[PDB]
Design a protein around this motif. Sequence first.
Motif, PDB file in Angstrom:
ATOM      1  N   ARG A   1     100.518 -16.927 -27.912  1.00 13.49           N
ATOM      2  CA  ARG A   1     100.814 -17.595 -26.675  1.00 13.49           C
ATOM      3  C   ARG A   1     101.558 -17.142 -26.199  1.00 13.49           C
ATOM      4  N   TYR A   2     101.904 -17.331 -24.840  1.00 13.83           N
ATOM      5  CA  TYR A   2     103.041 -16.854 -23.478  1.00 13.83           C
ATOM      6  C   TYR A   2     103.911 -17.586 -23.021  1.00 13.83           C
ATOM      7  N   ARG A   3     105.075 -17.316 -23.402  1.00 16.61           N
ATOM      8  CA  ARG A   3     105.576 -17.717 -22.516  1.00 16.61           C
ATOM      9  C   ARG A   3     106.616 -16.567 -21.995  1.00 16.61           C
TER      10      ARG A   3
ATOM     11  N   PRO B   1     106.536 -11.164 -22.159  1.00 21.49           N
ATOM     12  CA  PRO B   1     105.756 -11.672 -21.376  1.00 21.49           C
ATOM     13  C   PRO B   1     104.476 -10.880 -21.744  1.00 21.49           C
ATOM     14  N   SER B   2     103.337 -10.981 -20.374  1.00 22.81           N
ATOM     15  CA  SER B   2     101.961 -10.181 -20.635  1.00 22.81           C
ATOM     16  C   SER B   2     101.770  -9.256 -20.676  1.00 22.81           C
ATOM     17  N   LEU B   3     100.771  -8.487 -21.680  1.00 24.62           N
ATOM     18  CA  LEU B   3     100.697  -7.174 -22.134  1.00 24.62           C
ATOM     19  C   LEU B   3     100.746  -5.852 -20.507  1.00 24.62           C
ATOM     20  N   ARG B   4     101.777  -5.032 -20.944  1.00 17.81           N
ATOM     21  CA  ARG B   4     101.137  -3.520 -20.505  1.00 17.81           C
ATOM     22  C   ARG B   4      99.622  -3.338 -20.061  1.00 17.81           C
ATOM     23  N   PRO B   5      99.304  -2.311 -19.172  1.00 18.43           N
ATOM     24  CA  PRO B   5      97.704  -1.800 -19.025  1.00 18.43           C
ATOM     25  C   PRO B   5      97.417  -1.092 -20.659  1.00 18.43           C
ATOM     26  N   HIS B   6      96.649  -0.881 -20.771  1.00 17.70           N
ATOM     27  CA  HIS B   6      95.641  -0.815 -22.202  1.00 17.70           C
ATOM     28  C   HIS B   6      94.568  -1.049 -22.857  1.00 17.70           C
ATOM     29  N   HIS B   7      93.707  -1.153 -23.552  1.00 13.07           N
ATOM     30  CA  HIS B   7      92.623  -1.017 -23.726  1.00 13.07           C
ATOM     31  C   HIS B   7      92.382  -1.264 -25.629  1.00 13.07           C
ATOM     32  N   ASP B   8      90.826  -1.666 -25.546  1.00 10.13           N
ATOM     33  CA  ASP B   8      90.724  -2.410 -26.496  1.00 10.13           C
ATOM     34  C   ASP B   8      89.588  -1.341 -28.165  1.00 10.13           C
ATOM     35  N   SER B   9      90.462  -1.739 -28.991  1.00  3.08           N
ATOM     36  CA  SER B   9      89.809  -1.175 -30.480  1.00  3.08           C
ATOM     37  C   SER B   9      88.207  -1.739 -30.631  1.00  3.08           C
TER      38      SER B   9
ATOM     39  N   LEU C   1      86.257 -11.721 -26.968  1.00  2.00           N
ATOM     40  CA  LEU C   1      86.736 -12.543 -26.375  1.00  2.00           C
ATOM     41  C   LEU C   1      87.919 -13.245 -25.960  1.00  2.00           C
ATOM     42  N   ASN C   2      87.630 -13.578 -24.308  1.00  2.00           N
ATOM     43  CA  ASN C   2      88.516 -14.541 -24.234  1.00  2.00           C
ATOM     44  C   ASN C   2      88.047 -15.851 -23.500  1.00  2.00           C
ATOM     45  N   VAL C   3      89.162 -16.834 -24.264  1.00  2.55           N
ATOM     46  CA  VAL C   3      88.727 -18.171 -24.357  1.00  2.55           C
ATOM     47  C   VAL C   3      90.012 -19.153 -23.859  1.00  2.55           C
TER      48      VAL C   3
ATOM     49  N   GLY D   1      95.992 -14.910 -14.663  1.00  2.00           N
ATOM     50  CA  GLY D   1      94.805 -14.583 -16.044  1.00  2.00           C
ATOM     51  C   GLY D   1      95.130 -12.928 -16.167  1.00  2.00           C
ATOM     52  N   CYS D   2      93.924 -12.169 -16.063  1.00  7.74           N
ATOM     53  CA  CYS D   2      93.470 -10.947 -15.949  1.00  7.74           C
ATOM     54  C   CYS D   2      93.394 -10.401 -14.958  1.00  7.74           C
ATOM     55  N   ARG D   3      93.707  -8.699 -14.795  1.00  9.30           N
ATOM     56  CA  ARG D   3      93.949  -7.766 -13.951  1.00  9.30           C
ATOM     57  C   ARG D   3      93.307  -6.196 -14.722  1.00  9.30           C
TER      58      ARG D   3
ATOM     59  N   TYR E   1      89.867  -0.660 -17.267  1.00 10.95           N
ATOM     60  CA  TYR E   1      91.439  -1.341 -18.284  1.00 10.95           C
ATOM     61  C   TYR E   1      91.244  -2.173 -17.516  1.00 10.95           C
ATOM     62  N   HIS E   2      92.364  -3.232 -18.509  1.00  9.74           N
ATOM     63  CA  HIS E   2      92.504  -4.795 -17.989  1.00  9.74           C
ATOM     64  C   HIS E   2      94.817  -4.732 -18.127  1.00  9.74           C
ATOM     65  N   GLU E   3      94.932  -5.708 -17.451  1.00  7.00           N
ATOM     66  CA  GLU E   3      96.366  -5.606 -18.116  1.00  7.00           C
ATOM     67  C   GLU E   3      96.725  -7.673 -17.659  1.00  7.00           C
ATOM     68  N   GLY E   4      97.232  -7.513 -17.815  1.00  5.09           N
ATOM     69  CA  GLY E   4      97.423  -9.752 -18.349  1.00  5.09           C
ATOM     70  C   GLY E   4      98.490  -9.659 -17.276  1.00  5.09           C
ATOM     71  N   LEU E   5      98.362 -10.555 -16.011  1.00  8.92           N
ATOM     72  CA  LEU E   5      99.381 -11.427 -15.615  1.00  8.92           C
ATOM     73  C   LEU E   5     100.498 -12.319 -16.112  1.00  8.92           C
TER      74      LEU E   5
ATOM     75  N   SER F   1      89.073 -13.166 -29.849  1.00  9.82           N
ATOM     76  CA  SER F   1      88.568 -12.147 -30.381  1.00  9.82           C
ATOM     77  C   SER F   1      87.739 -10.526 -30.204  1.00  9.82           C
ATOM     78  N   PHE F   2      87.967  -9.997 -31.684  1.00 15.02           N
ATOM     79  CA  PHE F   2      87.904  -8.325 -31.225  1.00 15.02           C
ATOM     80  C   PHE F   2      85.960  -8.588 -31.743  1.00 15.02           C
ATOM     81  N   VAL F   3      85.264  -8.241 -31.288  1.00 10.62           N
ATOM     82  CA  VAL F   3      83.408  -7.901 -32.405  1.00 10.62           C
ATOM     83  C   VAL F   3      83.110  -6.345 -31.608  1.00 10.62           C
TER      84      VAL F   3
HETATM   85  O1  LIG Z   1      95.517 -11.115 -20.741  1.00  7.46           O
HETATM   86  C1  LIG Z   1      96.814 -10.214 -21.376  1.00  7.46           C
HETATM   87  O2  LIG Z   1      97.956  -9.934 -21.446  1.00  7.46           O
HETATM   88  C2  LIG Z   1      95.432  -9.560 -22.260  1.00  7.46           C
HETATM   89  C3  LIG Z   1      95.650 -10.075 -22.817  1.00  7.46           C
HETATM   90  C4  LIG Z   1      94.425  -8.792 -23.639  1.00  7.46           C
HETATM   91  O3  LIG Z   1      93.115  -8.089 -23.415  1.00  7.46           O
HETATM   92  C5  LIG Z   1      94.124  -9.004 -25.150  1.00  7.46           C
HETATM   93  O4  LIG Z   1      95.575  -9.726 -25.942  1.00  7.46           O
HETATM   94  O5  LIG Z   1      93.596  -7.592 -25.863  1.00  7.46           O
END
Ligand SMILES: O=C(O)CCC(=O)C(=O)O
Lengths: 568, 706, 19
Positions: B623-625, B630-638, B643-645, B658-660, B686-690, B702-704
Amino acid sequence: LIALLARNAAHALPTTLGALERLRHPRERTALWVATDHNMDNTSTVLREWLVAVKSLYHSVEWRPAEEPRSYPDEEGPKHWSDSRYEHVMKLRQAALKSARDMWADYILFVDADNLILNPDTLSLLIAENKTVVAPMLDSRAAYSNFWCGMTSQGYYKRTPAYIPIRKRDRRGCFAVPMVHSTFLIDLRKAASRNLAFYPPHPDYTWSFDDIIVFAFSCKQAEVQMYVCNKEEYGFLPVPLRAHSTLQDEAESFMHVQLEVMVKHPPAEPSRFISAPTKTPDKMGFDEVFMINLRRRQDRRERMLRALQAQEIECRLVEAVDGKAMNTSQVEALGIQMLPGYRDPYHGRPLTKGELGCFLSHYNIWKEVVDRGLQKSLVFEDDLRFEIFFKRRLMNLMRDVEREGLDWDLIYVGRKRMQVEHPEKAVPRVRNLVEADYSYWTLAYVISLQGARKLLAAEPLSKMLPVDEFLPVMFDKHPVSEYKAHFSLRNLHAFSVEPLLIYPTHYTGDDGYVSDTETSVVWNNEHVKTDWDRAKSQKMREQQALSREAKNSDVLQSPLDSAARDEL
Amino acid sequence: PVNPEKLLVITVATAETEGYLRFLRSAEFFNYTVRTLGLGEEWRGGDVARTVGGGQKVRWLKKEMEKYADREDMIIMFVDSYDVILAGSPTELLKKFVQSGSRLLFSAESFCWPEWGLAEQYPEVGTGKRFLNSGGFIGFATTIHQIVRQWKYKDDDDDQLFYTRLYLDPGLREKLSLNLDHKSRIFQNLNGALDEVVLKFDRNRVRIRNVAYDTLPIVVHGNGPTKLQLNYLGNYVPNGWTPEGGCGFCNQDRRTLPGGQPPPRVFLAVFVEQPTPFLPRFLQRLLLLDYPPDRVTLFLHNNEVFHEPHIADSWPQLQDHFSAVKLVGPEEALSPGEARDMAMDLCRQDPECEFYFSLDADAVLTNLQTLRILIEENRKVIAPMLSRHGKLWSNFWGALSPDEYYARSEDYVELVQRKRVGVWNVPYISQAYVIRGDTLRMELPQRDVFSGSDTDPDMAFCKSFRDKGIFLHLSNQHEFGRLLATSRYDTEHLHPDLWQIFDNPVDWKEQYIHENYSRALEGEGIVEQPCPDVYWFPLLSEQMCDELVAEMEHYGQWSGGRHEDSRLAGGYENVPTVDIHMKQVGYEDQWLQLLRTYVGPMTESLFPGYHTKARAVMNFVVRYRPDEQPSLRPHHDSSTFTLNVALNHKGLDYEGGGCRFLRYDCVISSPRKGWALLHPGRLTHYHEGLPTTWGTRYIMVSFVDP
Amino acid sequence: AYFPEERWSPESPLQAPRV
Ligand SMILES: O=C(O)CCC(=O)C(=O)O
Ligand SMILES: O=c1ccn([C@@H]2O[C@H](COP(=O)(O)OP(=O)(O)O)[C@@H](O)[C@H]2O)c(=O)[nH]1
Ligand SMILES: *[C@@H]1O[C@H](CO)[C@@H](O)[C@H](O)[C@H]1NC(C)=O
Ligand SMILES: [Fe+2]
Ligand SMILES: [Mn+2]
């Protein structure tokens, strides 16, 4: 392309190879895809010898020997057919089918090692019906055969109302069946035969995982009705063994099958390319092996000698005085006098020359046994039907009787139970042994020295009668008390065994029923010769009349006398 | 060379039942000459086969033969008309009769039914049967006149003992040449010889064969307690269903609703019980059937308080729709037997309902023309063919065990999977059927059919309807539906339907999975690629999203946010979020099942050459409020890809972004409520959230394949 | 499981010759 799939089959390979070679088809238009696997015996070398010897006649041949290893890892024993064994068999059969399809080969007869195609017209008559999968009716010593009559719920054999009417050859003509094991001829000529699959089970199969049903589901689900015909005799096959037996029992079953083949047919000559592992004879633990034979008849004598050789039992062959050719001058010299007021209890004749000769032969045999001090002996006739595992069972019974200790003098090995009544008494601590009673057709009897001495002390030289009638009187079991009153002693202690180890070779009023011991001249005169008793056969067979509440269930059964599978 | 015109068939039937019609069809198939006697007369006898009877048939035939008292030349054959179906042509029958050469032939039976004393008086027979059965006889008119002129007894007297006493006299037997078909050449009685018959197929007809004797009979008389087996055999012989030509008596005899008149009044019914999942869907489907709402009269008997709110919500659309609507709530404490009984009474006592059509709770009629085709069939009873999805459990049986319990026939596996098509005689139907109202009125006058015994109401109803002698058809020409499964259904959730992904897959996918998803899978566009290696395809429908957020807010516990963790094995999150993982909810396994089944094909089609078993370890909802996190810092997924629904609609509930992606200068600004995002998440992207501005947004991640 | 069938199929046509 007559392929095969064998495993430890050397016990009967020499005869099967010759029978296969006896087929009357163009050898330039034949083949073989033989292979062996998990064979603990030396069947590999025997197969290789014949394969090398006959490599010129066949248009082609192939082999994939798999002697290593000799047994499965998760196998209960030699006779255990587990999941791994069934899967291997299915894979081998499907590989044989695939190889049969790659050579543009029409028809394929995947006959196993146990089967023996005795008749010469198997591949000649079978392929003449234009069938999809035609199978031959392989008979045997019992009901079990290669033609089931219907699956009930999950592939189990269901005794249909026609199996007995079919196996008895009552009706001749191809009739459809739900399963046909062993000798199949899966003709690859027809187009619909392109879908039959063995190893990969069809996705719509919900029955068990056996190897004899996966072919049935593929046959039915492809609309190829596996017909089967029993128009003419084809051969013989062995009954399956139990799940904990040994290869020696299988060899004994094969030998019994060979003997049954020799019962009414010429002996099955083995292969010429391969050798023959002849065995050494013995005496089965007995002291003497008596054998009464007729000089005129020699084919029966030759058959008996061959059976003894196959049984690995040595015989002390004996001869008998021809009563029919005997005259009064020699008969009266021996002091042989007929019994007072004795005649035939079924016809009315006083006596016969053949009966006198048989009685004289029996008396001479008993005198020889007494003089030699023979503790035990076996006396037989010129026509008998030996049982499977007869030698081992007889030896075990004799050893048990001797070890337990009893006054056994007239133990019955073969008799016709004319005493239609309830079960007889059972002696304590005796396995498959009961007290004897009134019976006929006593061609075989295991007597002792005490019994022979008692019979000699009886000395019925002045009272001549049939041996079958004197024996029941000697055991104090004769129906008529007049014979007992004429007799003086009844010290004989008779006994009987429920598992009879012999039966007459030919029943009365049947094919080849030459009643030489019955049809003979009278004791007096020479113009009274009663022919074969057509109407008054009387002693035909003591089996149909005994098919009633005869009980005989409390007798202790031996570990032997057990065979057959889901089929009988 | 006996001419066929000299044979006349004589049968008796006081009333007209389905069995007599079946014998009529069988006789007319081979173009016979049948005469019926006692049509409409009152049965002056009694119990047909309980103890004794049949004394009216003999008096009727004694009256009958007087017109043929001297007619030697023709040949007469008498038989029942309720439990006999012919199989052979008349030429074969007359040839067999000529071959036998006797003056009178009777059907041989296994036992001595009327009396046991006279058994030894019978002449000995080698293999065939020995006794005589009065089921049927063939002979000359003079012979039958002479043999049965002596009858002078009461109309309630028995018949077989009379025929036995007559036959047992040896002098007249020699005089009149009485003979019995011991080898079943003409007559074959199923009673006691059940295992010696096998159907022998052909191209355009069927026949029976006695494997015991290898003969083909002409007449079968399935007397005794073998009505069921002859009902079964009547499905094929002699024109029922052959491999060439489909079935037989199935397509004729149709009303086809002519005249433009209002369709016959129908009394719909529903008996919701053993709480069925997907109930509201079933109620809303109850409105779209192809039938005028003014001619349908609903009767909804509920039996669970748990379903009360659902029926309450459904009710005013139903009351607005159908001509008459009723209810019987959970408070009346009525057993299902009582409910079915009073519904049957309610329609039975209203002369306006012509067709009482029951409809149990769990029978989804995906076909909407079922009532039309069923009423068009005009069968005395009928039931649509249904089956559990991916099994053999259907809504009927093939044959009955002696315990009156489920046996397994030989064609059941063929009928369930639709290898043969037609209308099949069946000894038990359930969960849907259409009863002709007349059979209710003057064939089922008594009320207590479902109750009155310890047996279950359905089996008891079938048992009662069976002995009265009314056939129970079953049709499988088209696809009608499928039976749901209520073996287990927990209800300790706000929406316990979400856990039904394993039990009933098709309906679960129909309700929850986004409607457009299949068309996207088969490849007709839809899927968008806003940025390279980034994909947009629709996965979830609004129902799933709203129920998921409702469940999560029911849990409410919004753990997470601190840089450390106890759920993580390491205990050190790369970046913390206010999240609810699926392991604590108990909904992790169903999520993995959804990932395996509905995601994998999509990704294997989108990224060709890749094979995926769809394994996941980490998966949650975030949940984002604007105040909490706030939205996440730039990062990477393991993981290989993520999946982003989304779960709620932007603008109407929240405002944000959305994402950036940094490496591609890519911005997602309009996340859709029911769509999924696919992008690699290890090396390249490399993605970050708005950051959100106003409202509240929910995102499922979800991570698959990590 | 009463009155089992004998589902009858005719013989298939002969396959084409080799070449
Ligand atoms: O939209 C975001 O803040 C990033 C979400 C994302 O990639 C994550 O939650 O791993
Ligand atoms: O209500 C009635 C009146 C008469 N019958 C007649 O009774 C005869 C004998 O009945 P079933 O065939 O049931 O006889 P079973 O051989 O079983 O005694 C049938 O042929 C019908 O004609 C009947 O079944 N029901
Ligand atoms: C499914 O796709 C069609 C495309 O024409 C669209 O009109 C419809 O609204 C979509 N359904 C949804 C988004 O639920
Ligand atoms: Fe991510
Ligand atoms: Mn009847």
